[PDB]
Amino acid sequence: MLLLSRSDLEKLISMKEVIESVERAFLELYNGKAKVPLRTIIEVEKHNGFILYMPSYLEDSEALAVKVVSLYPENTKKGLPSVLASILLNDPKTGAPLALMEGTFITAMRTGAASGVATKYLARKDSKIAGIIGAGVQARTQLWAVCEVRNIEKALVYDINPKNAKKFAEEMSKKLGIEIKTVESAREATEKSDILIVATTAREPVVKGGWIREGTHINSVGWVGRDARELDSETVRKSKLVVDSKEGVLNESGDIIIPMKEGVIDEGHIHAELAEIVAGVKKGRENNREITLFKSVGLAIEDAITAKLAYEKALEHGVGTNVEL
Amino acid sequence: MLLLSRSDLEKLISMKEVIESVERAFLELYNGKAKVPLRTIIEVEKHNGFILYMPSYLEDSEALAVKVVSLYPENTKKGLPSVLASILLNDPKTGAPLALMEGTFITAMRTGAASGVATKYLARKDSKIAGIIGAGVQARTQLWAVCEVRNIEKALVYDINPKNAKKFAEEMSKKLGIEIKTVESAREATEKSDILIVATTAREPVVKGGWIREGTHINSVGWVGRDARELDSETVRKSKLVVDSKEGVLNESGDIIIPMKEGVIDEGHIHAELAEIVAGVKKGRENNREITLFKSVGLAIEDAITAKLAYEKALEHGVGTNV
Ligand SMILES: NC(=O)C1=CN([C@@H]2O[C@H](COP(=O)(O)OP(=O)(O)OC[C@H]3O[C@@H](n4cnc5c(N)ncnc54)[C@H](O)[C@@H]3O)[C@@H](O)[C@H]2O)C=CC1
Ligand SMILES: NC(=O)C1=CN([C@@H]2O[C@H](COP(=O)(O)OP(=O)(O)OC[C@H]3O[C@@H](n4cnc5c(N)ncnc54)[C@H](O)[C@@H]3O)[C@@H](O)[C@H]2O)C=CC1
Ligand code: PRO
Ligand code: PRO
Structure with missing residues (x-):
């Protein structure tokens, strides 16, 4: 398995790329080539938080990914960001896990880019x-x-x-x-x-x-x-x-x-x-x-298209660390 | 966050431990202290396989975990196991990820243990x-x-x-x-x-x-x-x-x-x-x-109590790699 840290990801991806990629993910979704079941939300009432499980499979792009992202609005009081995420990429041919990547930076990138494509058509x-x-x-x-x-x-x-x-x-x-x-x-x-x-x-x-x-x-x-x-x-x-x-x-x-x-x-x-x-x-x-x-x-296809974008650039750039499990 | 491999996990947990723990998870589920929404199954028709996403929250045990497990019946033809899994543990207080651990060994242990509990009462x-x-x-x-x-x-x-x-x-x-x-x-x-x-x-x-x-x-x-x-x-x-x-x-x-x-x-x-x-x-x-x-x-709570049993033993035993 390959590991990609926030420092690794910031290096690999830019917003112009993510805007193009999120746009293609939605075009792939319209043509019936996306499997996006509704995300599962578990509310942690005891600690004033949410955790969101967002899997998706884009069959043309062959991006099979799940993001585990959490929202704790009082986290900024503990020196922690409100939104923390992790993204797992699996191999569509074997189901084997391919990569674990930091998702916090990708969440912000894919969210801005999603509004970026909408801004192009609506503003x-x-x-x-x-x-x-x-x-x-x-x-x-x-x-x-x-x-x-x-x-x-x-x-x-x-x-x-x-x-x-x-x-x-x-x-x-x-x-x-x-x-x-x-x-x-x-x-x-x-x-x-x-x-x-x-x-x-x-x-x-x-x-x-x-x-x-x-x-x-x-x-x-x-x-x-x-x-x-x-x-x-x-x-x-x-x-x-x-x-x-x-x-x-x-x-x-x-x-x-x-x-x-x-x-x-x-x-x-x-x-x-x-x-x-x-x-x-x-x-x-x-x-x-x-x-x-x-x-x-937020829609899970934006994480999968961005994670596969980032993952394939890491291979071409030799970025990330390999681990055994 | 901590990384746990099959070699790390195989030593840590035993079948007697998992049976006690899985039985306790099911009691916790009965008392309304578990959040186990039905798991999401994505069928990869293109490659004859399934991938399963199993999140759950056990509030008394404070085990907040999701397992990503896959079933590819033709994997044994490629020298690969039919079932491959990964388990991610999150911190209930902050939502932060605590550990990524191999789920194949845990899925086998918890599946045997779930039947171990049933056998005790039914056989x-x-x-x-x-x-x-x-x-x-x-x-x-x-x-x-x-x-x-x-x-x-x-x-x-x-x-x-x-x-x-x-x-x-x-x-x-x-x-x-x-x-x-x-x-x-x-x-x-x-x-x-x-x-x-x-x-x-x-x-x-x-x-x-x-x-x-x-x-x-x-x-x-x-x-x-x-x-x-x-x-x-x-x-x-x-x-x-x-x-x-x-x-x-x-x-x-x-x-x-x-x-x-x-x-x-x-x-x-x-x-x-x-x-x-x-x-x-x-x-x-x-x-x-x-x-x-x-x-x-298969039920997600059995993964969560087992993942947290193992994560909690790894800290006390100094097992795993930090990243
Ligand atoms: N694709 C999507 O739609 C995603 C949704 N979100 C949501 O976007 C929002 C922002 O997320 P983050 O920037 O990461 O959290 P953050 O905590 O880092 O930033 C939130 C900002 O909102 C400010 N704020 C809060 N209440 C305000 C009020 N009444 N008036 C004026 N300012 C106020 C806060 O002072 C803070 O600066 C959150 O609600 C989050 O749940 C987060 C990631 C992507
Ligand atoms: N209940 C739960 O929580 C879980 C359910 N499973 C399911 O358990 C089953 C086995 O899982 P694994 O042992 O990991 O896969 P495996 O591929 O390692 O073992 C399956 C065995 O079943 C044998 N078999 C296949 N067809 C047969 C037939 N007609 N007659 C007699 N034997 C046959 C095969 O030779 C093979 O030895 C699968 O259906 C799996 O999807 C997997 C993990 C836990
Ligand atoms: O979809 C997302 O990533 C954001 C995270 C917090 C709520 N929604
Ligand atoms: O519950 C589980 O983990 C197994 C995986 C394949 C089908 N059910």
Whole structure:
């Protein structure tokens, strides 16, 4: 078996590659060449956490992988990231395990790239100002993937944690070579956005629909269970809704389940799944005045296409350590 | 996180340990302190194999583990085991991964132990002769666990491959210190058995119910999908049926699903789940003449308590590699 550490992975993969790869994974999913059973969620109520088991098999790409990822929103208080993951790659021909790789970095990369492909189809091409609510691990790759897809000029970041917003604005500004300024309310970041990035831990809405002007595109990736949401009901109803997967969002995302329980929206309010948009069967952004919202909770195909991408580059680069079991 | 190889694991855990631990896991499951959602099976039709994802959380034992196990019946043609597994242990307090360990040895140990617990409650205490149909990997731990709970004197082994039965008879007899004789039909092994072990890869019945005499207890652990079976409908109908879990067997075991399609039995023919037997809520063996059948497909909690037993012994014994 081969081992790939976070240091190993950061070396191998870039966001432009991951954007292309996640896009192909969804095209493979639309053509009936993907087996993605709904992920299994075990809630650890005793320790305020979740653990998610996300297996998938992409038969054309021959990517047979499972990711074990956990969400503990209070982990940052113990010097630990909220999201920790591991990815296992198996050989489709024998079922033998091929690799164990650190999944935390890949989770952030594949999540940003998933919103990157959706941003290509749903965001105004002339978008230059991006607003970020929640300056955590996901927000960094979220903004990075948005910058790979649009000619972003300036970014606004709001967080309840002043350290996270400052560290984000400083470090990401040199990172992406764009100006990033911390703002001091979620209202301001939402009102001035051409593209809005929401990557929060909050269990109650932070984005009010009354702030969103026309022509803005929203990427929302936060998830803390089916009871939690970061967008109020007005935001969802007001937008042209695209989901990463209907089966996943409708079963896991309080951002959608709660407004439908209220009766503000129904299952038909979902315009399309991302797989239909990538395939060209369903259309993305059609005019300047619509407000587009991409709701993402995570799909296992993004881990498999990224893990096999990273695994095959390690072989070609001689990266990683071999182990016996 | 810590890495544990088969060589690391093989020393650490014994069959007496795993039986005690698996029985405790089933009691924990009965008391509502286990989260064992039904496992996810992805069939790789393209390569004639299955891969199984088995997560579970035992909250009292604080064992949060997932096993990735695969079944490729044609692997023995490539010099590879039919069943290959990996087990990942996570920290319940942080969600952080604690260990990656080889699951092949643990799956054999926990599978034998699960039948070891069932045999203790369902088999006659005066059982002396054990019959084995299918002399593969699982059969060895199956007989070992039966030997840990009953005073077995002699074993009879039948396999469709005479090489496998002979190799089983030789190797297992030295390990367990009991006489083991090769027979040349499933009928003979079944007819003379006090306890019958069935652990085959067959997709069609190998044991006929007409062969089973009264007082026999059967452990059947084979699985090759819900369309495959190693027991004919008569063995199922004739027996008091105990399953490791109702949700798993009725969804995955052709040994049970097919006789229910025929109308020979219905859902009520399941006497009890193993968890109810361990808890004492349901009765085990009530008389000497009953024929008892334990149907096992595998349950994620048995992996979790065994993985955490081993992980916890590795730390105390300084075994494993950090990465
Ligand atoms: N493909 C997907 O959809 C995936 C979903 N997620 C979810 O994305 C979200 C972000 O994940 P991470 O960045 O890794 O965690 P993180 O803990 O490192 O960052 C979360 C940020 O949200 C901020 N925040 C929390 N509540 C806020 C509030 N009311 N108002 C303003 N800011 C607030 C926090 O201060 C923190 O900076 C999480 O909800 C996670 O469950 C995580 C990985 C990928
Ligand atoms: N109940 C549980 O928890 C578990 C279920 N299993 C299943 O147990 C069965 C055996 O597993 P392993 O021993 O690891 O595989 P194995 O390949 O090592 O052994 C299978 C044995 O069955 C024999 N056999 C095959 N067809 C036969 C037939 N018609 N008649 C007589 N003998 C036949 C084969 O010669 C072979 O020796 C498989 O179905 C496996 O999927 C595997 C792990 C645990
Ligand atoms: O799918 C994922 O990877 C993220 C992890 C936390 C919740 N969802
Ligand atoms: O429970 C298990 O581990 C075995 C693996 C193959 C089918 N059942």
